[PDB]
Protein backbone atom coordinates (compact mmCIF):
# COMPACT_ATOMS: atom_id res chain seq x y z
CA UNK A 1 0.00 0.00 0.00
CA UNK A 2 1.75 3.21 -1.06
CA UNK A 3 -0.47 6.24 -1.56
CA UNK A 4 1.55 9.38 -0.94
CA UNK A 5 0.85 10.77 2.51
CA UNK A 6 1.95 14.28 1.53
CA UNK A 7 -0.57 14.45 -1.32
CA UNK A 8 -3.31 13.35 1.03
CA UNK A 9 -2.55 16.10 3.50
CA UNK A 10 -2.67 18.68 0.76
CA UNK A 11 -6.08 17.51 -0.23
CA UNK A 12 -7.31 17.48 3.38
CA UNK A 13 -5.99 21.00 3.99
CA UNK A 14 -7.55 22.38 0.81
CA UNK A 15 -10.43 22.92 3.26
CA UNK A 16 -9.70 26.24 5.00
CA UNK A 17 -11.49 24.98 8.08
CA UNK A 18 -8.85 22.36 8.63
CA UNK A 19 -5.98 23.49 10.78
CA UNK A 20 -3.65 20.84 12.08
CA UNK A 21 -3.53 17.18 11.25
CA UNK A 22 -2.34 14.36 13.50
CA UNK A 23 0.61 12.19 12.59
CA UNK A 24 -1.34 9.04 12.01
CA UNK A 25 -4.36 10.55 10.33
CA UNK A 26 -3.03 10.60 6.75
CA UNK A 27 -1.72 7.05 7.11
CA UNK A 28 -5.15 5.85 8.12
CA UNK A 29 -6.68 7.83 5.34
CA UNK A 30 -4.42 6.12 2.85
CA UNK A 31 -5.80 2.78 3.88
CA UNK A 32 -9.37 3.99 3.65
CA UNK A 33 -8.78 5.45 0.21
CA UNK A 34 -7.51 2.13 -1.00
CA UNK A 35 -10.58 0.26 0.18
CA UNK A 36 -12.73 2.97 -1.42
CA UNK A 37 -11.03 2.54 -4.80
CA UNK A 38 -11.33 -1.25 -4.61
CA UNK A 39 -15.05 -1.27 -3.78
CA UNK A 40 -15.97 1.41 -6.33
CA UNK A 41 -13.87 -0.27 -9.05
CA UNK A 42 -15.36 -3.67 -8.39
CA UNK A 43 -18.91 -2.43 -8.30
CA UNK A 44 -18.32 -0.68 -11.59
CA UNK A 45 -16.77 -3.80 -13.00
CA UNK A 46 -19.98 -5.76 -12.46
CA UNK A 47 -21.82 -3.26 -14.64
CA UNK A 48 -19.07 -3.89 -17.21
CA UNK A 49 -19.57 -7.67 -17.01
CA UNK A 50 -23.35 -7.25 -17.35
CA UNK A 51 -22.88 -5.12 -20.48
CA UNK A 52 -20.63 -8.02 -21.67
CA UNK A 53 -17.79 -5.55 -22.41
CA UNK A 54 -14.17 -5.77 -21.24
CA UNK A 55 -13.15 -2.11 -20.80
CA UNK A 56 -14.12 -0.30 -17.62
CA UNK A 57 -15.42 3.05 -18.90
CA UNK A 58 -16.65 6.26 -17.29
CA UNK A 59 -20.31 5.31 -17.72
CA UNK A 60 -19.60 2.14 -15.71
CA UNK A 61 -18.66 4.35 -12.75
CA UNK A 62 -21.72 6.57 -13.29
CA UNK A 63 -23.91 3.47 -13.04
CA UNK A 64 -22.17 2.21 -9.95
CA UNK A 65 -22.64 5.47 -8.15
CA UNK A 66 -26.40 5.32 -8.66
CA UNK A 67 -26.78 1.75 -7.38
CA UNK A 68 -25.11 2.15 -3.96
CA UNK A 69 -26.23 4.63 -1.30
CA UNK A 70 -22.74 5.09 0.20
CA UNK A 71 -21.67 6.50 -3.19
CA UNK A 72 -24.63 8.90 -3.42
CA UNK A 73 -22.35 11.83 -2.54
CA UNK A 74 -20.60 11.34 -5.91
CA UNK A 75 -23.60 12.05 -8.14
CA UNK A 76 -22.76 15.77 -8.14
CA UNK A 77 -19.51 15.12 -10.03
CA UNK A 78 -20.19 11.88 -11.92
CA UNK A 79 -23.72 12.30 -13.22
CA UNK A 80 -25.27 9.40 -15.06
CA UNK B 1 -5.68 18.99 -15.96
CA UNK B 2 -2.00 19.20 -16.86
CA UNK B 3 -0.68 21.92 -14.56
CA UNK B 4 1.21 20.97 -11.43
CA UNK B 5 -1.30 23.05 -9.53
CA UNK B 6 -4.21 21.20 -10.97
CA UNK B 7 -2.53 17.88 -10.52
CA UNK B 8 -1.93 18.59 -6.85
CA UNK B 9 -5.67 18.35 -6.13
CA UNK B 10 -5.59 14.61 -6.88
CA UNK B 11 -3.69 11.45 -6.11
CA UNK B 12 -1.33 10.57 -8.99
CA UNK B 13 -3.06 8.65 -11.76
CA UNK B 14 -0.40 5.93 -11.61
CA UNK B 15 -0.96 5.18 -7.91
CA UNK B 16 -4.72 5.12 -8.53
CA UNK B 17 -4.51 2.84 -11.57
CA UNK B 18 -2.42 0.26 -9.80
CA UNK B 19 -5.01 0.01 -7.11
CA UNK B 20 -7.85 -0.23 -9.51
CA UNK B 21 -6.21 -3.12 -11.23
CA UNK B 22 -5.81 -5.06 -8.04
CA UNK B 23 -9.58 -5.41 -7.84
CA UNK B 24 -10.05 -6.55 -11.44
CA UNK B 25 -9.29 -9.87 -13.17
CA UNK B 26 -5.94 -10.01 -14.95
CA UNK B 27 -7.59 -9.73 -18.37
CA UNK B 28 -9.51 -6.55 -17.50
CA UNK B 29 -8.60 -3.15 -18.94
CA UNK B 30 -9.52 0.40 -17.91
CA UNK B 31 -10.06 3.37 -20.22
CA UNK B 32 -8.25 6.64 -19.60
CA UNK B 33 -11.37 8.63 -18.66
CA UNK B 34 -12.26 5.97 -16.09
CA UNK B 35 -8.91 6.49 -14.36
CA UNK B 36 -9.47 10.26 -14.25
CA UNK B 37 -13.04 9.92 -12.98
CA UNK B 38 -11.71 7.62 -10.25
CA UNK B 39 -9.11 10.30 -9.47
CA UNK B 40 -11.85 12.87 -8.85
CA UNK B 41 -13.95 10.44 -6.79
CA UNK B 42 -11.01 9.84 -4.43
CA UNK B 43 -10.40 13.55 -3.85
CA UNK B 44 -14.14 13.99 -3.34
CA UNK B 45 -14.07 11.12 -0.85
CA UNK B 46 -11.19 12.76 1.02
CA UNK B 47 -13.00 16.11 1.19
CA UNK B 48 -16.32 14.53 2.19
CA UNK B 49 -14.87 12.61 5.12
CA UNK B 50 -12.60 15.43 6.21
CA UNK B 51 -15.54 17.77 6.21
CA UNK B 52 -17.26 15.63 8.85
CA UNK B 53 -14.16 15.03 10.92
CA UNK B 54 -13.43 18.70 10.88
CA UNK B 55 -16.90 19.54 12.08
CA UNK B 56 -16.68 17.15 14.99
CA UNK B 57 -13.40 18.47 16.38
CA UNK B 58 -14.56 22.03 15.89
CA UNK B 59 -17.60 21.32 18.03
CA UNK B 60 -15.21 19.81 20.60
CA UNK B 61 -13.04 22.97 20.38
CA UNK B 62 -10.03 20.99 19.21
CA UNK B 63 -7.61 22.16 16.56
CA UNK B 64 -6.28 18.84 15.38
CA UNK B 65 -7.93 16.25 13.23
CA UNK B 66 -6.74 12.79 14.25
CA UNK B 67 -7.44 9.18 13.36
CA UNK B 68 -10.36 8.78 15.78
CA UNK B 69 -12.23 11.71 14.23
CA UNK B 70 -11.72 10.25 10.76
CA UNK B 71 -13.24 6.86 11.59
CA UNK B 72 -16.09 8.45 13.51
CA UNK B 73 -16.75 10.51 10.38
CA UNK B 74 -16.70 7.34 8.29
CA UNK B 75 -19.26 5.68 10.55
CA UNK B 76 -21.43 8.81 10.46
CA UNK B 77 -21.31 8.94 6.64
CA UNK B 78 -21.99 5.25 6.19
CA UNK B 79 -18.67 3.62 5.60
CA UNK B 80 -19.08 1.03 8.35
CA UNK B 81 -17.41 -1.76 6.48
CA UNK B 82 -14.11 0.14 6.30
CA UNK B 83 -14.22 0.93 9.94
CA UNK B 84 -13.60 -2.48 11.42
CA UNK B 85 -10.22 -3.17 9.79
CA UNK B 86 -9.15 0.42 10.16
CA UNK B 87 -9.92 0.41 13.87
CA UNK B 88 -7.45 -2.37 14.44
CA UNK B 89 -4.93 -0.54 12.30
CA UNK B 90 -5.26 2.72 14.14
CA UNK B 91 -5.12 0.85 17.45
CA UNK B 92 -1.63 -0.35 16.48
CA UNK B 93 -0.47 3.25 16.57
CA UNK B 94 -1.77 3.88 20.03
CA UNK B 95 -0.64 0.66 21.62
Short structural description:
Chain A is mainly α. Helix content of chain A is 55%, strand content 5%. Chain A has helices at residues 5-12, 25-50, 58-67; strands spanning 20-21, 55-56.
- Envelope shape of chain A: elongated
Radius of gyration of chain A: 15 Å
The major β-sheet of chain A equals: none
Structural class of chain A: mainly alpha
Q: How many helices of chain B?
A: 5
The main sheet of chain B comes to: none
Computed CA radius of gyration of chain B, to the nearest angstrom: 16 Å
Secondary-structure element order of chain A, N to C: HEHEH
Main interface pair? A-B, 48 and 54 residues
Number of strands of chain B: 2
Number of helices of chain A: 3
* Percent range for β-strand residues of chain A: 5-15%
Helicity range of the residues of chain B? over 70%
Q: What helical percentage do the residues of chain A reach?
A: 55-70%
Distance between the termini of chain A: 31 Å
Blueprint (SSEs and pairs):
The complex is a heterodimer of chains A (80) and B (95).
Chain A: H1 5-12, E1 20-21, H2 25-50, E2 55-56, H3 58-67
Chain B: H1 4-7, H2 13-22, E1 29-30, H3 32-59, E2 64-65, H4 67-76, H5 80-94
Domain Core Histone H2A/H2B/H3 (chain A): 1-65
Family (chain A): Belongs to the NFYC/HAP5 subunit family.
Subcellular location (chain A): Nucleus
Amino acid sequence: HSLPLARIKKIMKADEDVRMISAEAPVVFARACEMFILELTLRSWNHTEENKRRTLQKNDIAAAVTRTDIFDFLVDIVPR
Amino acid sequence: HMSPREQDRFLPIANVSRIMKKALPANAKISKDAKETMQECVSEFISFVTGEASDKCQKEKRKTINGDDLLWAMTTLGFEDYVEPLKVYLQRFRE
